[model samples]
Structure formats: C-alpha cells, structure tokens
Target: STGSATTTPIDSLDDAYITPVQIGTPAQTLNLDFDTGSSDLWVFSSETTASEVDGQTIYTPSKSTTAKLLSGATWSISYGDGSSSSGDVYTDTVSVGGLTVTGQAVESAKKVSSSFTEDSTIDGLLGLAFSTLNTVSPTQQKTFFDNAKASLDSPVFTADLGYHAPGTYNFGFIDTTAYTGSITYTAVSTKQGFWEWTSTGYAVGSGTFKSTSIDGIADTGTTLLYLPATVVSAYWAQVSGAKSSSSVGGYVFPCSATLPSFTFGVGSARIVIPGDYIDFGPISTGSSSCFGGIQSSAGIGINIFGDVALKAAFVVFNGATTPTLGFASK
Candidate 1:
C-alpha cells in the first residue's frame, strides 16, 4: 500500500512544511515537520517541562493504550541551527497518511531548546533521513518510513514543495501528475545519512553555467539554498547594492533589484530556480532590503539545496540499494 500526505507551508514563512501524523492507539494527531536532514520522530509530550511546552500541542502517550515504554532508552540531538531536543523513548503505532507502522519508536521530548519552545505551531519533527541517523540510544531506531517500507509498493518517496502553497509528499509510490517532463537520475551519496549528490556545475543569473563540482544535500528541513562562498559571492556581485550583513544574517540586496535566475545541474538536466524564488521576501517585513534565498555555506561544511532549490523541482528520494535522487521540473 502507498501513502500520501499534503505538506503545507506554515505562515508563509517558507521555512518549513507541516504534515499531519497520528501516534499511538487512539491516534493523537500532531502537525510535524518532515525533515530530510535529520532522523528521529520526536514530539513534545507530557514529560516536557510546562515552561518549555509553549502553545504547541503535546502527545500524551498515557492516553494511548498501545504506548509501550522502551525501558531506559533515551534520545538527544542538536541541529546545526542550534535547535535541539532530548527525551525518553516509547514504542507506539505511528501513522502517516494511509501508511501505518506498528511498534514505531517515538521519542517523547522532555527537554527542548529555546528555538523549539518559541515556535508555537511546530509540535514536533518527523525525520525522513536514513535510519542510521535516528537518535535512539543503546540501539539506533528506524524512522516511520523505514518501518513501513516493506509494506510500500516501492521503497521510494517524492518531495514536491511549493512556493507559499500546499505541496504533496508521496510515499511508496510516485505521482506522475505532480511533475512534468522526464526525471533526470543521479546517484546519491548516502554516507552522511543525507540525500546528497554532487552538482556538476552551476550558473548565476542567466550567466553561463560553470563547471564546478560541489557536494550538496537536498534538505527539506533547511529553508535557503546554501552554496560555496565563491559561488555565493559570484551571484551577489552581479546585483547592485548587494552585501552580506552580519545583523541581517545573510546576503541582502535592494528589494527591487532585478535578480536573475540561478540554475544548477543534476546529471545532464539543468534545474532553474526563478529570480523571484531567490528573493525570500524582505530582510524584515516592510524593509527595503531583501535577503537572498541563496547563502554561503562556508562554515556549514556541506552545501544545502534547501526549499529554495527543492521547490524548483519534483525530487524523488529512492531508498533502493545505492539510493538515487531523481529530479524533474514541476
């Protein structure tokens, strides 16, 4: 059986997508961010400190008759962005769309960083990364998708992110209608527990595509596209009055600047991101300066093809042996 779900942008922030997921016997529904950058399905729960819970929904395992505590198991994880959570583990039934996995390890967060406590709408995270990245201690845990893979018609899922709109994430099957044209396939380097592939070249603002092999990860969790400093600088240099700001946290340019489209190569296919998509709104709402959706990943170690890049194409995350990434324009 295949499962599919709608992933809608939260608050037009374009930072993440929220999907509905059910946990436990009675099915406690929660809006979770389906992250491809990390592994672990963790949720705010009864164990969370009242002061940290904020206005987010909590999953009370006690209300679920099928919730089973994993004696002494614990989990803790931190993201590059400084967001983190730690908690105990419990085995429960987890359902995503029409797909259900029995005895799925659900990490219940007891402690959360300020980043999470301040986010009132995001209740939890559902990791779509490889099972090797799961945070469960003693023994690594499998993700909901990993647990349900055997039941899927094909061990594959597609991420179709939209610009300030609703998108769909289909599991166990691909929706041909979601995308147009042929998909260009490339081998994914899964050594880092990420769906990573090298971009043979990149072009800036209608400029000739440069042959610069850069390792990049297709991360659903990240909001902006991150590239090498040299490449980022190249793009900004073309726009008048564009500069990197310490306070604004990225390269910003005049909101009215005529930004050109950026394109990256996936195998033999060139995926072009429109100029408007590269302008991630204003630096601050009503501000005259706008932040470039593409930023430098000098310190981040790896380049990230985040929502800004992913939304430009329909991506298939095939988990077959030697996992491959299939990209096609939408």
Candidate 2:
C-alpha cells in the first residue's frame, strides 16, 4: 500500500508545513504540522482549555464512534523554545492521504503553551521521528509512520518540501518525477530518536568546499537551518550588512543586502540553497532588517538541517530496522 499527501506552507516565509489528517468514524479533518523532529502525534482537541484555544480546529473524541480512551495513557512534550503541550491519549482510526491505520494513538491536548495558542495555522503536530522519542507515560506509542509502515509497499517515506509553495509527502514509495538525478544514500542514527546524519562538508556561495564532518539532524519541525558558528559566520561574512545582534537573538542583515547561497554535502552530492531563500522575512512588519534563515547552532548543542535546507532537496526517510536516509536534487 502507498499514500501521498500535499503539504502547504503556513506563510510566505515557509515557517512550517501542514497536512490534513482525518480521525474518527465520521472523519474530523484537522491540519497538522508534520514534524520530523519529535515523535508524538498530538493535537488540540475538545479537551483543550477553552481559554487556550485560538482559531485552530480541534478534534473531539466524543464525536467519534471509533475513538476509545486509553485509560491511563497520557503524554507531554516540550520544545527548545520552551513551548509545550500535555494531554490524554485515545486510540482511533486515523487516515492520512489514502492510508489508514486502525487503533492509532491520538493524543488530545488538555493544555497548550502561548506560542502554540497564538499560531492558529497549526491545529497540532504529527511527529515523524523514531517512536522511541514518544513521551507517553508508562506506554510509549508508535508514530503514524511506524504503525503504517508494515502495510506499505516499501518501508520508506519522502519529504519534498517547497519554498513558499506547496510540496508533498509520499509514503511507501518514491515518486520518480519528484526529483532529478540519482538519489544519494546515507546512514542514519536513530539512537537519538532523530533523523541524525553527518554532512561531508559545506561551501559558501561559489566558494571553496570546506572538507570537514558536520553532524546534524533533518528536522522538519524547526523553521531555520542551524550549523556550527564557524560555518554560519563564514557565510554571513560574505554579506555586506550582516551582523549578529544581541537584541535580535540571531544574525540579521539589511533587507536589501546581497545574500550568498549555501551548499552542503551529502555523501558526494552537493545541495545548493539559493540566496533568496536565506533572506527570511523582515525582523518585524515594515522593518528594514531581516533575520537570516541560517544561524549558528552553538547554543543548540547540535546542528539542525531544518526546513531551510530540506526545502532545497528531496529527502527520503527509509524506515527499515537498520534505517537510512536518501537525498536527491529536485
């Protein structure tokens, strides 16, 4: 079996991508952020505090005849930015695209942080990382991918993210038309419960390739690309008016500055991120300074190849017992 789904960017900045998911007997459609950084399929639901609810659509388990309470199962998750959500668990018939999974764990939110409440575009998050990262107490549950993999024609899924455009997420098989050239394969470490891999090197716009190892995770949940300070500083140095700002909390440059492209190596393959993609929107509405799409990961402990990088290439997450990752140009 196979499935394909269209994921649309929440805004022009492509800060996040959301896909429609159906849960319950009659099917309650909710737009959820397909996050590869975490492993809990959680959602804002009827259980969420009324005051915490903004304009997001919510899932009501009571309305679904197929929904069954998990009794003692509960979950909670926190992000690096301090945003968090906690909730009770329910087992229900869930469907994504044309794929269906019986008795899938669906976490319904009872509480949400201000950040999640304010972002009305996302109803919740559907985690795609390894199941070990799930936060359900006493009984950790499998992710939607994990539950559906066995029935898939091929135990793999692909992420074709777009910059300011709608992209696709394909499960069970790769779409040959989605990318060009041969796919490059690399080993992935699920030990950390992330799609963790190492890059061969990187280069600044039309510059010499820096031959060094850079370990990072392909995280769709994160909005920006984060690398070591050495690489980030080198790239920013080529921009005329770019500078690290204490007040802004990251590297920002004049809106009109000429930004350089960034290239990273995967195996022998090199993926180039266009200069325009690096110029994230203005720091604030009508501001002349813009925050950079690539930033230093020094404080993050590990580099993150977020949407900024993923949108530049076609990525495949092979869900074998011994997992591997594939990259190709699009």
Candidate 3:
C-alpha cells in the first residue's frame, strides 16, 4: 500500500492504541491492547507451534480465511521486562466498534524467546508504543486507528480499565457526546512519547500531598505503577500499620484498605489515588499489591503510576487534537 507520516509523536514505551478486531471465518473477536511502549502488532498464527502457546488465541491465514501474510518479511519484538518474540508479518481486515481499518499489521511468531517459552496466558501484545527504531516507516506505517480516525465521529480517545471486571478498552477517535465534562489537556513534550513530564509528587492522610518536582512520563504500557523513593517513603510512612511488601519484583502492600486519599498533578490537573491503590498491585502473596503509589525511585529516578494508578480514572492520549494528555472521569 502507501507509506505513513509522522502524524503521532511515537514513544519508545508501549504507545500502541488498541480496538477490537474480528478476524477469520468463524469470526472470533478480541480486543487489541495498545501500547506506546513498542510499535508492533503481536497475534497468534498457525505458524506458532510452541507448546507454551496452549490456550493462546492463534490466527491462521487459511483458517481465518481472511488473514494475509506480509510475504517473506519477518517481525520480532523484545521488551525491557525480559520478554521477546519473533515471527512473520500479516495483514487482515480488522474491525473495532463501528469502524474498520484495513491493511493493519499483525505479527505471527514462529519462534519465541525464552521469556515466551514458558507459562502461557499472554496470547499476544499489540505494541502501540512508538520508537524511531521500529521497522515501520513512520511515514508509511499504518496502525489500527490511523485509518479509522477520519471516519470516527469525534477525534478523542479514552481507555477504561478492568479494575471492576477486565474493564473495557476501545478506540475510534472519540465521541465527545459521551463525555459529561471538558477533558483536561496537557501539551506533549519533545521527548519520545509516553506521558513524560514532571508530576506534582506524592501525598498522604488527606494533609496536603506534594507533587513530584522531578521530570517523568505517564506510561500505559507498564503493569506496575512507579513513584519516587521520597514519595514512596512518605506514603509508606502513613501506611497505617504496614511497612512494605514485595510482589511484582517491587514493593506493594495491601492497596485495598482504609488508606488516605492521595493525588498527583498532571500539568494543571490533579489525579486522585485511593488508599487501595496507595499500596495496590496484583492479588495474592506473589500478587502482593500496592506499596505506595510513589516509590524509593523518587530522588534517583522517575515515578510510574502503573496499572493501579491508571485504573482509577479515564485516560486519554489526545495527541491528535491537543498536544497534551487528557485525564477525566469514566
């Protein structure tokens, strides 16, 4: 087909935006998880024969009766989280809500890395994250929503999480009519994507919370939320009766408790954090949840709100209209 333009400021992180696509003859539908972290569309295909792929939703060109491979070209992706995979390329007619975007890129892994060679469940990841390093020629590349944008009723986008039940995630520009109030916007920095910016820091016990005076970004691709050490210490200090817990290879306590209300500043907007999210994280011991939205990475590094941080409200990447980010009520 044709090439694409540098329309979106691609981030190195999971900057991908997802929508549901119904591929194949029987027509199975699955939600495409977007990430600004990596620019890749990973899906299962008949070519994938690894035993670890059990229970995974794999797509076959002949089976789907609609899937098409990108000729002899191959695609592979590696993540900083110690996971990676390699496969061939394919294009299929993808549908999302009331929109359909053709010529979409999809990956078919034939040989996966060690990370993916074990415990299944991660059927696939559609990397929305952009990086100059991607195989896509920013000028010629086409993503799920790129073509659907013009057909969308509104040019806005929102991501609802699974906190309350695998939440719903969609894309199609935006439907401003569905919104009740104005969406708070923030200008995007010259930085390589990911809502990279300085936060208002951390807070606790309803007293006045401090925002991070440090520079950082908001990452949706990340599963665990991160905060500065100072912010973590402060929140941990007020953790009623907990010291700290480790689960996600990080510190997370029982986020679900009578915790204090904490907030973080995103430009002029203030995002509230519930006590549950204060120490929130996955369930169980290894699932040890939140430690404090903020972490000891405070002074030495940037903070990440992770999934716990994002699950609390409506998140919109307004790169199309406002150069800034948008946060609102879901």
Candidate 4:
C-alpha cells in the first residue's frame, strides 16, 4: 500500500467525520484507516467485546439484512502506535465512492483495548497502501486494492486526500477528472510492509527553508506527520506569534498564530500540509489536531507523512500502470 491521506471514517458512527469515510449508494459505510504501513481491510463484528467496541460502528449483519460471516475464520492486527484489535472474518455487501463490491473481505473485532472499545464512531481502517509493512496478513492473502481490482471498472485507483470540507476517497477505478496526470513518480524500496522513501527536503510556502535533514517513512496508517524536534521548533519559530505549548502528549500551538502553510517536497511531488491541520483547541492544538505537527525526531531515521500529509495529494499505488510510484496532482 502507498502512503495515502489521513482518511477519517465518515459519521464516526455511520458516515461523516474528519477521517474514515463511508461512501456508495444507500452507502453501507466502512471506516478506511488508509494505512501506508499495511494493506488489508478490517471492520468491527458482532462478536467484538462491548467494552472494546467504543466510538466505532460495528458491522451489523442482521441490520444489513444481507451480510454473511465465514466459519472458523479469525484475524488480528496491532500497530506501532500500540493499538491492537482481533476478531473473525465476515462477508458484506459494501460500496465506496459509488463503487460497490459485494462479499468483500471485512473483519469483526473479537478483542480490542478499551481505548478502542469506547469510541463507537471509529468503525475500522481501509488498508489501501502498499503491502510493505503488512504484518497482519499472511503471505497468501492479497490487499484491499488487490482484491478490489477485479471488481472495479478500471485498473486505475486514485487516493484523493482532500481535507476539511466533506472530502471523499474513491477506490476501484480512478476518476479521470481527478487524475491530472501532472504527477511525479517516485521509486520506493519495499521494507517490511511499507514503501520507504528517502528525504530530499521540505519547503514552506514559497520560502526555501532547509529540510530537517532527517529521513522518514511516509505512512498512511499514521494519523499525523512527525518531524524532528529541532525541525518543528525551527518552523514554529518562524510562525508569527504561534507560541509553543504542550498538551495531549505532544507539542501544541496556537491555531490563531500566523503560521505559514508548509509542504513536503518528497521524491518529486510536493505535499501541501495546511497549518490548520496541525493542531486545534482552546489556545492549543488538541489530540485530533494535526496542525501543530510533530518535529522532535527529525535527524532521526524516518518521519511518516501519515494521513495529515497524504490527503493533500492524489496518490496512486500501482500494482499495474507503472513499475514505480506515481503521483498525480488533484
């Protein structure tokens, strides 16, 4: 899977939220995690513990009135962020962005941490990136894109990571209008289950700012972009009146500050990261705030682009089309 955008599932409960989108006719929604770390589709199930089923929308087979479950099937996944959930497999009639795929490989939660159990709105993750970091799936199973291709009308699948205005993400076929074709292709070295990229540098607006000099992975599974500490401090220093603060276990900043819009010019495509996506809160960027972005680990190994950065551009993970990574402008 490729490092796509921070796709929030729609309706935290059914449809409509900042991340994970629910799409299609009568649109039986699914929360797409869009993880660049792995490529597998997972959703909640009936067997999932009520305690583990917090703000997420569980897959109701009885409610769908057309859903089915596989017998003797079990699944589990854990992220570097320390989030883990496991359950069995079930089949469902599903649709995304007007494209429908029946009997899709859906998952149900058998066990999850309380952190995941309480939030019922966060239904599930759509692992659309590359399989470089697919620790969850065994060798035989293909990824979300791999499985959906046969059902789609076209081979081109585009990731439209538009933020803050009821944006959408379409799988299966790539929309020509959305595919500007003015994209840059970057080569990636497959490692673990992720496509790793070398850091060239970053640019803030039109200014020629120096990159943090740290190389990092661009992960869609990641929710926010993380930079080195010195790098974040340097950018914050340039923001007009954006005082530095701390909350929610990360660096926080004023949403009112005259922060400059930034972009990470990776490989060839430049990802425009909005300042508002950095952080948000009363005098501070909250947990959901992608705005005040992280920077303490630059000069380190890899800074993941995460969902915060992927939504800015149209990413295509080519299992066909190209032998390399292709990025088309939106």
Candidate whose TM-score is highest: 2
- Per candidate, the number of residue pairs that clash is 0, 0, 58, 66
Candidates arranged by TM-score, highest first: 2, 1, 3, 4
- Per-residue alpha-carbon lDDT of candidate 2 for residues 185-220, written as tens digits (9 for 90 to 100): 899998899999999999999999998999999999
Number of the top candidate by lDDT?
Answer: 2
Name the 10 consecutive residues with the lowest summed lDDT in model 1: 8-17
Candidate 3, residue 320: the lDDT equals 67
Q: Give residue 303's error in model 3 in angstroms.
A: 3.6
Candidate 3 lDDT, tens digit per residue, 1-330?
211111111221222223455655556565444555556766766788656476556667676666775776676666656677777777777654545666677677786665554534444665543334345322334555455566665544466553424444446454454344666766555256345556655557577856557555556566555666656667666665455544444454554546776677766666776665444444454644544444555432455555556666666655464345676654
Global fold similarity of model 2 (TM-score): 0.99
Q: Is candidate 2 or candidate 4 better by TM-score?
A: 2
lDDT, residue 171, candidate 1: 93
Predicted candidate 1, C-alpha RMSD: 1.1
Worst 10 residues of 2 by lDDT: 273-282
- Candidate 1 runs further than 4 Å off: none
Candidate 3, superposed: residue stretches over 4 Å from native = 1-20, 24-26, 113-121, 131-140, 173-181, 244-248, 252-257, 278-302
Q: Tell me, what's the RMSD of every candidate?
A: 1.1, 0.6, 6.4, 5.2
Full-model lDDT, candidate 4:
0.57
lDDT of 1 by residue, 189-254 (tens): 889999989998889876898987889999999999999999999989989999999898889999
